[model samples]
Target: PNQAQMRILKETELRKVKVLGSGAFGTVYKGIWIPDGENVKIPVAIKVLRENTSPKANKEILDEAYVMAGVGSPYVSRLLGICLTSTVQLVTQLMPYGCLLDHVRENRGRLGSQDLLNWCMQIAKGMSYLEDVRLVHRDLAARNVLVKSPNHVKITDFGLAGKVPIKWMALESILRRRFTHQSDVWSYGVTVWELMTFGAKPYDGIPAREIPDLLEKGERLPQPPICTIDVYMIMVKCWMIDSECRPRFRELVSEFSRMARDPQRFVVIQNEDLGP
Candidate 1:
């Protein structure tokens, strides 16, 4: 009785509003779905798989429903229903401000140190929910995270057939493709980096293919210009080559709660970059 995933709406039942977002993962729409025997039209985020998908691909996408149907977290986007048409669609609660990358880029020059740290705190809170349930958000990044407000953000695209977020992958994830909670911590660092810099590219001016070697040589992204040393240290900790050295999401959550109460001490008070 708790499964909304199998509550499939026909394509005819979707009232398309407009495009929400899209990329290699396919397109998402701000749409509405009406279920059988109910007049209510629910607003939702419809994620359409690429038109090239086969039954195999559809099956894998549908498998995501199993991973998500029982999952619940206010900090994590909620999957609401599905549409079984010529192409299967994943319906989720719409995140109005859209993905964090675009949101930060649009709000750059107006966001502050406290604002960025608050976003990092919200993301870590969401991640802990997944951690407690033993589910790994194989993909965690600013691009996959969405903002509901300055104080709230949610992680999406937990697992998918994908890559190109290569710069955010941890050492073990890059070498062995072994994903664990520690690997998520690695991406969380980069995600925080994105927020602190208001969406600047991570590892700018480097070849993605060269990162695995560079990391082996002890290289990591330079500290974000806007993050205080304490904030940047979290990213440094998350990047530790020994994946086991990374802090757990729960620890990050608690650390951020402490950070919020002392913004004057934790936040730097100069322009974005004015090194001594």
Candidate 2:
């Protein structure tokens, strides 16, 4: 009766190699799983819960797997299987490069404008797919997005996909706990700022308690040093107080699609280079 509808993997199959990270849900391990009748083992990310989790939390964990199973986009992380032996766990494709936040912090100066644009476009495409399916990634921030490779990224961590952060959340979400595809657009806008600034904290000096008031007063995160006006404009549109006024993910996909092809139109210049 505990068997999940998705692929079921045995606990013995995994090697429990190392811990990738820990979150409210559980610990994620960088491990290897050997399939039936296979000579080789494949890398995987296993998310396992502690023994004393509440039933509600365990249900939420299973719900995450169900949600991931329905989303088949390449831009989104693949839910490889589920291990339900002694402990309930999720096995996903291992992202060797880690999360987007780590990548930006470690490769800040080395990343060019084109690299930033490409990552943005990838994120937009992934979010666009989620939007098409009417799913709201309530926690769509740079830290939640994983880097599969230098130019490739996949949206992950759906365990807290419904949890909205005050800083990256839209006013509607902050005031009423309302989450929608539009709310995700707001978070995506903040993520764009994150990529542009190479992982700078959002609303740097503003206290968490003050973000809602500041946003209510029409204040948004300032443009980063190397952010182009056009790109920044898109981010601004995403943060519109009126949720309906925010651009749809499809529209973002279209805009990024254009920008990726004709980057000259959205070239970013260093802030210091501007003349008086």
Candidate 3:
């Protein structure tokens, strides 16, 4: 359906509205769905597409909903329903604490090291499941990971998810965007740093176009205080110059699990400051 003939309807009346976050693609609102006849209340994350005709914008909303519907898990957001009338509106489980990005930033210096490790472990587990199903979450970052509670992290936003086999893509295909399992792994490595830095920007000074080349040259975002030596080493391995050398999602899950379970056994990297 195209934009000219579409219309969207809100199922329940919204009372209180909270702006959760905004990005280039769309805006996410934390909305309360009030029950009229019944005595039940529903909390939802309403993600609405910003532009009607944008191919990138439309694909992001639709593809994310499709991925979420297919991969249902406690570690991932639940797609309650959708509005496909005019523009798109996707109703998802409203994460009370918002995204990990905001949480870490709020806690800043007070966040425990072990707890951060646990969060990263959960994210890896979720990504591992997605990889098992042959899906690559192209945009794996702190902002996209919602916090259901203090320690529980749910990976969300599948607008950027893509299937593997980039080498076989057609020259003129847009949906045929290049993405592989290793790219997800690389994103995971950056995410771990995000967790440790309390939502600090990854590769802040580097331009977007230069990131791939920078990564290829063996440059990783600097580790944060909470990042242990073992964890940092694992991230380096995941961001190997060659995608083939990067650790698989399953291996990443196992590595994080081990580190989370045994604190003293993991050495903290002390040689470098938390700077590049």
Candidate 4:
């Protein structure tokens, strides 16, 4: 049979509500998709392909969809399906709270130390699952983590091939275009920093061009004022120059679990200078 098996939605099925966000490959729109011959509507986030997207870029988008379909985890976003015809789009569950970066910035002081720890643990667990499946999320940042609300976050946009922030990339990734689970660990460390700082930019004063040299010199981002010593130590291990020295995502998940057990160890205090 040459027929496509999965649900194929026509353009008319989608009722565009609002622009969720835009990225290198396409723009994400928050919309409702109505199935054929049904009045029922489902909210979804549709990533519409940009008109200028090259064939190579289109393939990468499909590749991401393939990866997402195979990854089954509560901590990772769920891909509903894809639509292709006159237009192309990747449909996924709508995250009401938006990205983690936005949530942190908007609810800074309101988030308790325990809340922050849980978020980090969830992300670690998600990454650990990816590691188990031999998948590498080249881009792992607070901006890529989607918050579903009521203290739940899920890693989104995993394995999507596109531009990534130079500051969040591992030295090997920046210099050699090499991406591995270790490289993702490095980015995860930066994400932890972002969480503790309530979404502060990584490497504030350093220029992107100078980061490689600085990293080569064994320099790493300073510990966030709000982070506990144990957590900071984990982050330091992630930044090791020898990629082999970096802790595996499973190890990180274990460490975070231990920290979560003793809430007292994850206290967060105000650092006026560390403005969000």
Candidate 5:
């Protein structure tokens, strides 16, 4: 559990350094590890935790390590290891394509309908697997879904993940913050929106605290440019106020599978239709 004991290798000791992105927690860097003799590249994603914060503040870092260690699925992102001392780091398999967020932001509304459907289906597959293992991916947004290939996507960041209790409708907050499977389903609905909009920022103009209220009232971000009516409808189903009404991850997988398998039925694209 103590990543501090893990070996530390500096950037100079590493082959390459690429800044992936920045977040409230820390900077994400892409590094290539070289062996002693031959020119070999071992790619890894390193997440550095901000220094001087309370260890409690960084529990997610530790929790993510624990959750990731237990997860072994083709759909989930692979975890290499973690470093928990000063300048903590969590290393994992690198997604060469970067996050879905970057992809959608850069491409804007240019993705083909087939491509979009493929991405959503992959996400549902991954999420479905998580539920099979009794885990709930509390964060299921575009940024958390990474593209390994055009046909495959991997879910990452267990920072907000936790086990779903068999009996409870919801549990008290770990750090005094309550969370439930329903909350996770809500996040998934948001992810669908992200996919539809090519990773458009969610609730951008809307205040963060107001999201739950608006969502409870059945107001969500507008559908993406190339999404089909059925797909959008499924997303709406996921966002239903009644948690029980929201489709389970397994059901979502089935729906997505049907969507991906039937091209003639799933075709829904617009050339210049930016989402409303």
Candidate 6:
């Protein structure tokens, strides 16, 4: 188990380089981790729990830390250590480039079909790894993926940190509050939709409260502005009303790899379709 190699990072052992993001419970900082005996300074992303954090947030934070520490996948972010001091935190590998959503939005005109296909496959690979370990990520969206480079990405923000992302939830997840491998596949459908559109909003005109109704009425996000028929079909299959009918992450990885190799018609595009 990775627990054997993970360290208990003393608060003093980590230094904040800058704030990457801030939120209700705390801030995620670009930090440096220097173990007791090693003089080497390692860059890390420290998710910090603010002093006033509630008991709920504290436990959720630790839960994600534990989950992340247990998995080992290049496509999944790595948890290097934990810190339970004056401030609680999780020390994770630094995905320097930023989240996939903003990255795509920033470079929409520059995004290539090959890069998009590779990212989709890498995400499925990460999902397969987590499912192999018997964990349902519950959340799998573009914002939860961080760019390592144009060719690679890593999944992050496991355990929800907590929110009901209605737009990405499966029909069963919305109505029954159940999250399985299938439910995650539903979210991935939306994730891929975002990638296909270079990070466009999933349900651009719908309100979050109405998402469950839309799903129940057999509605799903439309084909992305510039997506191929094959890619759109892949996303559609994941949105099946019956979660059991959706493809497994393993199958998705296999299918995506096949397309990544060729990616001809499977990764079509229309640059003129994008709006200002």
Off by over 4 Å in 3: 1-16, 35-37, 54-63, 162-177, 267-276
> Cα deviation of 113 in candidate 3 (Å)?
2.9
Q: Write the per-residue lDDT of candidate 3 for residues 1-276, one digit (tens) a residue.
A: 221211133655544388777765567888866544667678877777666566666766665555566534567776766766466777766888888888888876556656777887899889888876677777788877988988898998775562322211111121334467777777788777777766777767666556545654656676566566677788777666666888887887788888878754663423223565
Best by TM-score: 4
Clashing pairs in model 2, backbone N/Cα/C closer than 3 A: none
lDDT of every predicted structure (CA atoms):
0.79, 0.83, 0.68, 0.81, 0.67, 0.83
TM-score between model 6 and native: 0.90
Clashes of 1: 0
lDDT (10s digit) by residue, model 1, range 210-253: 98999999988887766678988988999999987999999999
List ranges where model 6 is wrong by over 4 Å: 1-3, 50-63, 272-276
Give the lowest summed-lDDT range of ten residues in model 2. Answer: 267-276
Position 160, candidate 4: lDDT: 56
**Structure candidate 1, residue pairs in collision:** none
lDDT of 4 by residue, 109-177 (tens): 787777888888899998888787677888899999999985789998753532778998988999889
lDDT of 5 at 153: 80
Query: 1-276 in candidate 5: lDDT tens per residue?
Result: 333233334434353388887765577888876544547777878777677555575675665565566545677886766655566677776888888888777876567666777777778778777776677766567877887876678898665463422111122222235666665666677787877777667667775456445655656667665666788888777666566888887788788778878744765655436366
* Per-residue lDDT value at 65 in model 6: 68
Per-candidate clash tally? 0, 0, 4, 0, 3, 0
232: Cα error in model 1, Å: 1.1
Off by over 4 Å in 1: 1-6, 34-42, 51-59, 159-164, 274-276
TM-score of each: 0.88, 0.90, 0.80, 0.91, 0.79, 0.90
lDDT of 5 at 163: 42
In terms of TM-score, how similar is model 4 to the real structure? 0.91
| Model 5 poorest 10 in a row by lDDT | 165-174
